[PDB]
Nucleic acid binder design. Structure first.
Lengths: 82, 93, 54, 99, 79
DNA sequence: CCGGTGCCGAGGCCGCTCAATTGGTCGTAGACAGCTCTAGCACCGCTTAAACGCACGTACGCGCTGTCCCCCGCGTTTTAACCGCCAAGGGGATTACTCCCTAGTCTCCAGGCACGTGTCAGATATATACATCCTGTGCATGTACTCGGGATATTGAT
């Protein structure tokens, strides 16, 4: 079926993440909203990660690119290079 | 009822794995990156780092959302809490 | 934009208030200058909907 | 007999009056004395430039205004109009200062 | 004792710029704490910058540099 | 008529009986220690050369230091809309079950682009003579703050 992959983030996955966050009850309107938030985040990292791939005249996005993209947004990641 | 949920709460706060299935996340990342440029190739470590960072962000978001919900004498979290958390943290308005 | 704000204020000299208005009203400039504070520039007038009287 | 205003309209009057002007609120001399005593508590025999202390004053006022705006959002979230310290603690924690 | 120099009407005015209608009476004593703490960090830097230049006067650029290192940038004071 | 007393009903004690929890043992397999060059290569030793870093006076303003006056803070009063507590209706998120399905494993295949080296040439550091654009100083004047008085709202109490 022709379905958008944002719905590939299943409801049990969101429940698992919430339970790791420490929440007892989950309303039914979170499920569509959280995906939207998850979109926005990926719209502010991949966009940067592609630009570095532009500046190196490369065609494959490497882990260093995403680490640098996350570094400039005050969200530094450890253990994936750099 | 109300105690099997706390069982999960305690279980997941100890284990340290990826709570999102890898293939749908890969498809989502590829589709999101398609618009910027067609015909891209992805390092596996790049995808893993993306998923790790996104999961950490979501966990922090839900922590703040739970604080917001507790503030209003509730136990259930609703989008009214997520919007407030995002607004006061600084990603919107 | 600062000059447009100053004209809307019916004055021919730009002061920090006009710069603050121009930055805050425009979404992109506000996003660029999110973490900066303009000296003696104040804040936009804003009232929450629930705080209005009846 | 004297005309009395309802409790709350003077509040919005002051809101509108202060949200238009951009003068310094805190009296200059108490703020200067406070920063001087704090500095001496750290390092004695210090000299301060007037522009420096007025910039500290403006930074503090901007911080307080932003904090109170966040506090107002927190208070309205709890179906209230009066601000109590729990709102400030919640805002300060979500922003990521206190905790 | 000078923290009491931040009088109650001053706190009321600062609150009124923020857009709040009613102020609790016990807010001030906690709010004076925040002013007490947020100000104890920039000075930590402001004197320290001053102490690097072998000089013992706090110039208007040291406070700007401190606020920049902390993440709050201000304009109009030689930034 | 009222009261002693048997019969029955309920509350209190004690104890298993059984079903759910959690640390201890078995076991095997991919991955932390650990040479082994190697390899060439950064790091160290050993020289000088130049400049910036440092200290001494010394000129010169920008912070501390002393005196009058009201404007804002303090302190009181009453009173009222709001906070906090309580209670009931009902919807919906929870919990558990069966059924479907795509994640996960691994296997096989293969062509695209990361990645390094080798070549060479033009874009860029650098020195010197030229010169003009920006900067401190000085000064006219006018846009804007302030004071005063008359419009138009803008709320509260009958």
């Amino acid at each position: 079926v022709l379905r958008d992959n944002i719905q590939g983030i299943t409801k049990p996955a969101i429940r698992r993440l919430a339970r790791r966050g420490g929440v007892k009850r989950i309303s039914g309107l979170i499920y569509e909203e959280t995906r939207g938030v998850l979109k926005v985040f990926l719209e502010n990292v991949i966009r940067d990660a592609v630009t570095y791939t532009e500046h190196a005249k490369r065609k494959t996005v490497t882990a260093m690119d995403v680490v640098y993209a996350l570094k400039r947004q005050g969200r530094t990641l450890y253990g994936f290079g750099g | 009822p109300g105690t099997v949920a706390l069982r999960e709460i305690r279980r997941y706060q100890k284990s340290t794995e990826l709570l999102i299935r890898k293939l749908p996340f890969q498809r989502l990342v590829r589709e999101i990156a398609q618009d910027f440029k067609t015909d891209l190739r992805f390092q596996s470590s790049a995808v893993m780092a993306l998923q790790e960072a996104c999961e950490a962000y979501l966990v922090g978001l839900f922590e703040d959302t739970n604080l917001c919900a507790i503030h209003a004498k509730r136990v259930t979290i609703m989008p009214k809490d997520i919007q407030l958390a995002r607004r006061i943290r600084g990603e919107r308005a | 934009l600062a000059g447009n704000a100053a004209r809307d204020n019916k004055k021919t000299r730009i002061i920090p208030r006009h710069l603050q208005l121009a930055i805050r009203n425009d979404e992109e400039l506000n996003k660029l200058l999110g973490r900066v504070t303009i000296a003696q520039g104040g804040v936009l007038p804003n009232i929450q909907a629930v705080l209005l009287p009846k």
